[PDB]
Design an enzyme around this catalytic site. Structure first.
Site, PDB file in Angstrom:
ATOM      1  N   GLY G  23       0.812  -1.198   0.000  1.00 61.53           N
ATOM      2  CA  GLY G  23       0.000   0.000   0.000  1.00 61.53           C
ATOM      3  C   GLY G  23       0.852   1.257   0.000  1.00 61.53           C
ATOM      4  O   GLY G  23       1.648   1.492  -0.919  1.00 61.53           O
ATOM      5  N   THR G  24      -0.252   2.330   0.365  1.00 59.56           N
ATOM      6  CA  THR G  24      -0.360   3.724  -0.080  1.00 59.56           C
ATOM      7  C   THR G  24      -1.387   4.518   0.725  1.00 59.56           C
ATOM      8  O   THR G  24      -2.230   3.947   1.400  1.00 59.56           O
ATOM      9  CB  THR G  24      -0.759   3.791  -1.558  1.00 59.56           C
ATOM     10  N   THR G  25      -1.319   5.840   0.630  1.00 62.75           N
ATOM     11  CA  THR G  25      -2.222   6.732   1.355  1.00 62.75           C
ATOM     12  C   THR G  25      -3.543   7.074   0.646  1.00 62.75           C
ATOM     13  O   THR G  25      -3.587   7.214  -0.578  1.00 62.75           O
ATOM     14  CB  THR G  25      -1.524   8.063   1.649  1.00 62.75           C
ATOM     15  N   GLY G 163      -3.359   4.608   5.527  1.00 62.60           N
ATOM     16  CA  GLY G 163      -2.174   4.298   4.758  1.00 62.60           C
ATOM     17  C   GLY G 163      -0.932   4.823   5.435  1.00 62.60           C
ATOM     18  O   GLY G 163      -1.018   5.363   6.529  1.00 62.60           O
TER      19      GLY G 163
END
Lengths: 219, 242, 242, 219, 242, 219, 242, 219
Positions: G23-25, G163
């Site tokens: 992941g990621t924000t 995230g």
């Protein structure tokens, strides 16, 4: 169609009727089992537990089962709780429930009549108790004597007028062995045993041959 | 359904097959009449004494009995069940089991506990009895010992023992014991080794005249097994002392 | 289907068979009349006191009761269930269980917790009762102690105890207790050893006059079991003090 | 074919009919159980719970089952929640559903008639409640008295014109024992018990022999 | 099929029985009218604050409610289920459960999370309620606390608390609290200890006048349970400050 | 042989017919439940959910089941999702599928007729909805009033020509209690409850005794 | 059979309930119209960038959408199913689920992954939607955040995010965001914090003017949810830069 | 005995026949669903999928099931593979198989007639396809129009001589609504919906009331 119970019912009754008979009684030592049994090997009366006796009538294999089953159901309770809690009432109901079910469900009802007897512990003033359970799950609390098998009518009354409390053993054997003759011949070719309230544990011994002689009255 | 009370549990009620109060020493002797068992009565969890009156020998049936050493809790329930396993087989079959039967059954029951064994909670018994089916009713007494994995072993040396002080007792008997003898001589040699086991073993601790703690015994013969009296033991251990 | 409330759950609702609030000491004395139970009321999770009014002794049935030491959560539910097991067996069988039955049952329920035991959450009870089936109604009061692996043991010394301060209390009684005595004398010796248990054990902490924290008690006799009053206890502990 | 219900129903009705009877009533102390029971060992009335009584009629094994089944279903709730929540309604409905199902599915309907009784807690001014469940799963909330077994019509009316609230015990026994005789003989050879609202826990005791004497009215 | 919503899932849908956003403190007080709950609203996963407006106290039913401390995720679903268990038991039985029932139920549900408990994800509730069946409707307010292994416990001291700052709040109340009092005085002592809890515990952090973060409360009486107003709290915490 | 459905059907229709009757209606406050119920303990109308009421007729045990089954099927959805998603139409279909299956497969069809009623949320201008499901799984969306039990014809029409929207509660009570009398006697010995769209949550309350007086019209 | 597509699998097809691409924000904002979602597009398995065009925010149904953060693999299948779950329940019940329904369902699906979670492969979503059933259609937008153990939480602050760079983004918004605003102002503040998250987090890396990598967005309102155009974002991010 | 199928068969035919009817047709926009439904809540036509519609007749609960069952069997495939692989042929067969088995094994056959309709994707020149499955597992590939329920004969031919490809919607409504009237009365009290090939996804919308007016021709 529904009163198949009528039919099934008859099937057992008839099967029980067309066969040898048994008499169980209340006396001095405790309880006596006298039942016609020509067989040298297969019994009809058995120790069910510490203070418990059992005797049936009908197709052998069928009550044989019900017998083992009892032997088990008892042992189970005794182990599970305490031998001291194993009762007659208990194995009574039990049999009642079982037969009752068999009657209703099994493909063929059980041609059996059963008698469970319990002779008080090894001391207290409690008088033996008798239990009879019918092929369809019926029990009755008999305190005096009990008869099953073949034709009960003659043997039944032959006792109604012939029973006495505190009956000596030698005499209780007569009372019964007589009534038995009064419906059907009476050689020392049967099996007898007794639940002896004197005994401290087992309480069930069978009266062999050499000593049965001196108990049974002749013609 | 094979006349095994146990096997009935196996299929209809399976839930019946030093963190907790340990064992002690138990001895077995052979003789003219029959055989016997005598065991300490001290239960020890840790180095702490938990009980000094615990009976370790029980009469399995008319003609046999056994003493179990190991986790008291697991050992109690195990003998009781054995007893019942025996009595039930009789009531059902009408006759009793061979002695070699009673043993093979007891072995099965031990084999069953192996699980708990390998977790510390082990137990091992000693089985004795008058073999009503032995040819020479002279040497009709027998002793069977066991493994943890459930092995069955024959004495064939007149005596044996199990427990913490067993190595001791076994050795005392290797001296104080002789074949064909009184059921008074053997009940004597038992209380003896049961004394020496306590000498070299803080877990045992035999006859204690000061407290009134006396070894439990049982003798089986052609008449059957009977539990020796508290009198025949105390006035018997007093004799042993010096 | 064997009159076992338990066994019904076993087959129809199995879901009923210091991270959390601990135990305390409990004492048991025998005497002329019957027997009794007296136990501390301090629940301690860690070194921290969690509750000072927790009842540790319960009356299982008409003629019996028990105290349970160990994880409170597990010990409560276990006795409540034992209670029911006994009551249910009666209503079904019409009669009640032997005393030796009630104990064998209680033991099975303990053996049942063995799993949780070997994980810290262990609990051990102490069972007492007036054996309505005892020959000499003089020594009709009984004391049964337990294992963790579920062993059942007879007192046979007139007193016993369980819990942290048990070793203490047992020792106090070894001095301050004598056979056949009053149900005032024993209730006295109980509150006593229960005081001594608190002396040598921070986990207990018996009678506290300043706070009004008094030991819980229960006596059982030929009339049955009855929970001793808060008065009979305090004006009793005050007496013990010096 | 479909109105087998008719058949099966008759099967029950008849079997119940051709057998001894029972009477349950509301009074001063709480609730009285009077039923013809020659049996010295096998009861027909039983403590179902803290404030609950039970009494049936018909084949024993069948209602005996339903009795145990209740005992259990009560205890369960008591354990699961709080004895304080076990009610008579619960056990009523229960039985209702159970018999209802038996009637529909079992191979032979249950020749049983059952009465559940709850006598308020140990204090509040609540008047006892009575429930009756038939072999086919039918219940009714009787607040006064209930009768089942044998031939009800006579004993039934023999009470419709004989019932009184706040009825003394000794007298309630009369009211009932009487109506019973008016249909079929009346020796102190039956079983009688009571749900005594005075009691703090149990609330159900049986009136033994030596004490029944002084309650039952002669001929 | 025993009127337990839970038990229905048990057999028809079993899939409903600091890695993630933690707990906080919750207090409970008894009084003249009834009882009440007051709890912090700060959820903290790690040392990091995750939310400052989370409600920890819920109204379980007409005459009761509870607050849960421990993993928020677990604690929520748990009380929502508790509520249902109760409501469903009513609609079916027509009547509601005893207070003692609602409690025994809640405890079963807790015992049910014991697994997750021993894996960090534990939760413990505080149950309060007006016992509609209490003899003296004066002291009809009750407080039940819990174990992790699912033990049920009675307050019997007018107040309690659970959470990180419980030890602190309990101590505050041990001073700033007195028996039979106003439903204004207790709600007062609640916002108070809820303040001291926040003093000696960074996991709590009660009333924050600057942010507008006020303690959640709920009172139960003979009229039932009602959630106090945001106003009755703020103008109440302002009073407490100095 | 095949149109057993004919038979089975009749079995139910008849059983339903030969029993008391019920009426459910749409009015001002929400929904009203009037049904002949002599019982003091066993209801015939129940709170099914937040905005859901339930009433039935036929053999008790049988619809009692279906009542509980509903109580559950409702809670389930409410918990699984959101109380806000528990509808009347959901339980309707439910019941329909159930009954339709019993009918087809159970040994004896269910002698029951059921009515599910939902009174819109606590605000919006939605008018209540009514559902009736028959012993064979048949549903109908009734917006006005619904009658079931005993002999419907009389009471049915006695309403067709007697129904008015926004009907006051006291009057709605009349409208129905009247038509009930026109087919069968009418004492304040029944059970009545209502689904009050005023209420924010529960929405279902029962009109006790003391307050029913002032609502039911005399002879 | 309760209209849950999921639950159907449960009983009819159970096999459907940095080793791998992370992941990621993702950010969430509330506003006058409705609400919106914007999230980075960089998938990183280690410190190595695996993909820079991965869509993290999906439209669940007509009036709602959610972004998932965690293991790409596990997070994708999960949202696709959530969508299906919602659609199916409509085609069956006829109507669509409450917003509070959709959320409680999503939670359940999360609570279901908790196993994999405690094994590294954890995922966590951010749910948003226009509550067709909200009284004041002004604040009809909503934001629900989750646990790993499946907790459901209400935003109640206008914004949120999940995230790696969520702590960053959340902080940027704490400044650059104000209540009731344009669906242009918000989508602006979003692309903003999503820029700041990229500043203090190599795992995110928002708008990259040089590569043509622009944040993915979605707005929901009284008309429904629509995925913002690649133009409305780029000519929007260029505006943000200085 | 063996030609029970004859019987069962008749059971369904008759049940279906004795009930309202439905008409499905091919036209310009895609596919039209017109069926007699007085019900305000319970439909008879449903979105089965992206490009699929479903409409049936017979007992409600019974097709309602099969309806739900499709919705699922569809969703399943769309999730398992790709929404783009959910076809009408799949569901057709599926249903064929299901009913086929029901017919052969269930205690009572399904009094149901079903129609699965798929209106080609959102572009290509593919003409819709229609499917009909009978209570006994029979399917037919209808490309024009399909009729079911009640008495088909009149409405059936009333279309054979009334059908036109590319038919305008307003006109396709007439064509059908007419033929419907020719056998049984025709108020805007039915449910109509259509599978609109113009739509990109859903493809299924139901023509509400305010807009149906201007489509259905009067007497």
């Amino acid at each position: 169609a529904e009163q198949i119970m009528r039919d099934r019912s008859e099937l057992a009754r008839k099967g029980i009727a067309r066969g040898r008979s048994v008499v169980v009684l209340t006396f001095r030592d405790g309880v006596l089992f006298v039942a016609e049994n020509p067989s040298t090997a297969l019994h009809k009366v058995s120790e069910l537990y510490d203070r418990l006796g059992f005797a049936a009538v009908g197709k052998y294999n069928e009550f044989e089962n019900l017998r083992r089953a009892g032997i088990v159901h008892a042992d189970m309770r005794g182990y599970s709780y305490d031998r001291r809690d194993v009762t007659g009432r208990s194995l009574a109901n039990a049999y009642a429930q079982t037969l009752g079910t068999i009657f209703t469900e099994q493909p063929k009802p059980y041609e059996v009549e059963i008698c469970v007897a319990e002779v008080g512990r090894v001391g207290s003033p409690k008088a033996p108790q008798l239990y009879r359970i019918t092929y369809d799950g019926s029990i009755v609390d008999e305190q005096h004597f009990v008869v099953m098998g073949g034709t009960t009518e003659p043997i039944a009354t032959a006792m109604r007028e012939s029973y006495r409390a505190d009956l000596d053993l030698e005499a209780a054997v007569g009372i019964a062995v007589n009534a038995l003759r009064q419906g059907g011949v009476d050689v020392a070719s049967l099996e007898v045993a007794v639940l002896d309230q004197s005994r401290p544990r087992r309480a069930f011994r069978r009266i062999a041959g050499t000593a049965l002689e001196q108990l049974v009255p002749a013609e | 359904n094979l006349s095994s009370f146990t096997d009935y549990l196996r299929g209809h009620a399976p839930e019946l097959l030093d963190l907790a109060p340990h064992g002690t020493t138990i001895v077995a002797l052979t003789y003219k009449g029959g055989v016997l068992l005598a065991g300490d009565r001290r239960a020890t969890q840790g180095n702490l004494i938990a009980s000094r009156d615990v009976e370790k020998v029980y009469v399995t049936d008319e003609y046999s009995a056994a003493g179990i050493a190991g986790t008291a809790g697991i050992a109690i329930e195990l003998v009781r069940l054995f007893a019942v396993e025996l009595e039930h087989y009789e009531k059902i079959e009408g006759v009793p089991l061979t002695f070699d039967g009673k043993a093979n059954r007891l072995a099965s029951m031990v084999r069953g506990n192996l699980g708990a064994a390998m977790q510390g909670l082990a137990v091992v018994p000693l089985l004795v009895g008058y073999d009503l089916d032995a040819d020479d009713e002279s040497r009709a007494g027998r002793i069977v010992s066991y493994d943890v994995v459930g092995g069955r072993y024959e004495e064939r040396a007149g005596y044996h023992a199990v427990g913490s002080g067993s190595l001791a007792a076994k050795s005392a008997l290797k001296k104080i014991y002789s074949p064909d003898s009184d059921e008074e001589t053997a009940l004597r040699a038992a209380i003896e080794s049961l004394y020496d086991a306590a000498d070299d073993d803080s877990a045992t601790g035999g006859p204690d005249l000061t407290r009134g703690i006396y070894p439990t015994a049982v003798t089986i013969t052609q008449a059957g097994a009977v539990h020796v009296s508290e009198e025949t033991t105390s006035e018997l251990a007093r004799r042993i002392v010096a």
